Design a protein around this ligand. Structure first.
Ligand SMILES: CN1C(=O)c2ccccc2N(C)c2nc(Nc3ccc(N4CCC(O)CC4)cc3)ncc21
Lengths: 43, 270
């Protein structure tokens, strides 16, 4: 388990994310996704 | 465009049939989320490919503070990866088991958040069909998150016929072999409210047929410790006739909900 992922570093990082949310729609929702038809096909 | 190397893997969060969720940090934004990892071969052997596609299609198009968000997804040679919102307080069923039952404030808050999410789903003709504690998670301040859409359906026009959900939560109409609609979720919300407050579901029995019997007779027996407001809300949701059940807007506006909910809306980006 890396440090960021346990005890205090984690809670700290979770709190920051909650009160300072990012534009997840811009950051993630504008990014390409595989077609649902391609999911069980060649990557 | 994403791949597994875009993420630092932190620790396992839950094992499961298909089926492992990890705490993960997306590298370039240092953003903490969860990755659900599925094995392509196992899914196909099990013949659940269309099942999973439909769960992904539904949940990836829903954006609501009380529905667990699917930001994106990707796949490699052997695995499908779902990029999901991390619910830092974990499984609601675990918390219910730990406490036995929830107080009215906690239950009313969860009820408001549930009705708001389900209303968002119904606005879009999505019926969830399997609301129960095990399918709910909790956010940083305890906010309910509808987390699993395993029985869910987008149902624009046609009523439905599929018996689905969980024994203790089944609406009379499913048991009776009638077609159903979105009002199934109203019934399951009443079951949930009861289980929140009592710790057992209302039609608990040794056998499937006795449970079926208690459900179709709406054989509801309230323990004496419940307030009149909580019984009033449960009775208005657990109605034999789907069209007589309290609408979700009705649940949010219910006096017992207004008087007891301490619902907080998560901060939004801007
Ligand atoms: C994406 N996703 C799911 O798709 C999901 C859907 C349904 C059921 C479970 C799920 N899991 C495992 C998830 N768990 C958590 N959060 C989470 C947070 C904390 C904890 N713990 C609290 C108690 C400690 O003992 C262990 C850690 C567990 C799960 N966030 C997102 C999850």
């Amino acid at each position: 388990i890396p440090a960021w992922a346990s005890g205090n570093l984690l809670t700290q990082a979770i709190r920051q994310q909650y009160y300072k949310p990012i534009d997840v729609d811009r950051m993630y929702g504008t990014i390409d996704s595989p077609k649902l038809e391609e999911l069980f096909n060649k990557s | 465009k994403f791949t597994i190397d875009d993420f630092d893997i932190g620790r396992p969060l839950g094992k499961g049939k298909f089926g492992n969720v990890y705490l993960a940090r997306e590298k370039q934004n240092k953003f903490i989320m969860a990755l659900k990892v599925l094995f392509k071969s196992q899914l196909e052997k099990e013949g659940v490919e269309h099942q999973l596609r439909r769960e992904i299609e539904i949940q990836s198009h829903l954006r609501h503070p009380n529905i667990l968000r699917m930001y994106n997804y990707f796949h490699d040679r052997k695995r499908i990866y779902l990029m999901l919102e991390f619910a830092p307080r974990g499984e609601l069923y675990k918390e219910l088991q730990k406490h036995g039952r929830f107080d009215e404030q906690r239950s009313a808050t969860f009820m408001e958040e549930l009705a708001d999410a389900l209303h968002y789903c119904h606005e879009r003709k999505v019926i969830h069909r399997d609301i129960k504690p095990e399918n709910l998670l909790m956010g940083y301040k305890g906010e309910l998150k509808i987390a699993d859409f395993g029985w869910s359906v987008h149902a624009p026009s046609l009523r439905r016929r599929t018996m689905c959900g969980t024994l203790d939560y089944l609406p009379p109409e499913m048991i009776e072999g009638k077609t159903h609609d979105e009002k199934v979720d109203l019934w399951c919300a009443g079951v949930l409210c009861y289980e929140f407050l009592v710790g057992m579901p209302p039609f608990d029995s040794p056998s499937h047929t006795e449970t079926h019997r208690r459900i179709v007779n709406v054989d509801l027996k309230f323990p004496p410790f419940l307030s009149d407001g909580s019984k009033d809300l449960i009775s208005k949701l657990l109605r034999y006739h789907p069209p007589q059940r309290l609408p979700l807007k009705g649940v949010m506006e219910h006096p017992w909900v207004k008087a007891n909910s301490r619902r907080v809306l998560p901060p939004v980006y801007q």
